[PDB]
């Protein structure tokens, strides 16, 4: 099989905060926050799915590398047709997160949790408790957090 060179550096802040440092020691990092706070609402122009979630990083610099990193991150979940979380792109120029991933479904939450547990290791299971659950994806600056 083929080995991608665009593998980020994972680092876990805590049970709900995670970072994927852009490959080749980039000056940026993908920020993943597990939270039940809804920040984004469905709009006629911002709906996305796992197949074109890269379009939530259009106006960003080095958008190619961001797309490659998100591609690495979503391996094994996008190919799944039974993994259909609502994904809402956000206006980064207005201060919104790059993407909001609806993981309210027990199965979607379970899949995201298992992928992130393969990446970062053991942490608190967010799907035990019911209710709304989201993964907010943004791009933050690397300040040598780890
Ligand atoms: C997890 O880390 C973030 C980032 O520093 C912080 O805002 C948040 O309060 C932390 N959560 C807990 C439960 O400590
Ligand atoms: C992703 O593709 C769907 C159709 O498959 C489309 O409706 C949606 O607008 C696309 N996402 C973006 C951000 O353009
Ligand atoms: C997330 O999904 C649930 C059910 O799948 C839905 O009730 C909720 O409205 C969705 N979130 C948003 C912001 O639309």
Numbering used by the authors: 75 to 220
From the manuscript:
Crystals of WWAV GP1 were generated under two conditions, buffered to pH 7.5 and 5.6, and X-ray diffraction data were collected to 2.4- and 2.0-Å resolution, respectively. As phase determination by molecular replacement with existing arenaviral GP1 structures failed to yield a solution, the single-wavelength anomalous-dispersion (SAD) method was used for structure elucidation. Crystallographic analysis of WWAV GP1 revealed the characteristic α/β fold that has been observed for other NW arenavirus GP1 structures, as well as in OW arenaviral GP1 glycoproteins in GP2-associated states, comprising a seven-stranded β-sheet with three α-helices positioned on the convex side of the molecule. WWAV GP1 structures determined at both neutral and acidic pHs are nearly identical (0.4-Å root mean square deviation [RMSD]), indicating that exposure to acidic endosomal pH, and subsequent shedding of GP1 from the GPC, is unlikely to induce conformational rearrangements to the molecule. Overlay analysis revealed that while the independently reported WWAV GP1 structures were essentially identical and exhibited an RMSD of 0.9 Å, minor structural differences were observed in loop 5 of the glycoprotein, indicating inherent flexibility in the region or a requirement for the quaternary architecture of the GPC for stabilization. Despite utilizing a common receptor, WWAV exhibits a low level of sequence conservation with other NW arenaviral GP1 glycoproteins with known structures (e.g., 24% and 25% identity to clade B JUNV and MACV, respectively), reflective of its classification as a clade D NW arenavirus. Consistent with a low level of sequence conservation with JUNV and MACV, WWAV GP1 exhibits significant structural variation throughout the α/β fold (2.3- to 2.5-Å RMSD). Comparison of our WWAV GP1 with other NW arenaviral GP1 structures revealed that while the NW arenaviral GP1 scaffold is structurally diverse, especially in loop regions, it adopts a single conformation that is independent of pH or the presence of ligand.
The GP1 subunit of the envelope-displayed arenaviral glycoprotein spike complex (GPC) mediates host cell recognition and is an important determinant of cross-species transmission. Maturation of the GPC precursor involves proteolytic cleavage of the polyprotein into a retained and myristoylated stable signal peptide (SSP), a GP1 attachment glycoprotein, and a membrane-anchored GP2 fusion glycoprotein (1–5). We solved the crystal structures of the GP1 glycoproteins from Loei River virus (LORV), an Asiatic rodent-borne OW arenavirus of unknown pathogenicity in humans, and Whitewater Arroyo virus (WWAV), an NW arenavirus associated with spillover into human populations in North America. Both WWAV and LORV GP1s were solved at neutral pH (7.5 to 8.0) and acidic pH (5.6 to 5.0), permitting the first direct analysis of the effect of pH on the structure of GP1 in the absence of cognate GP2.
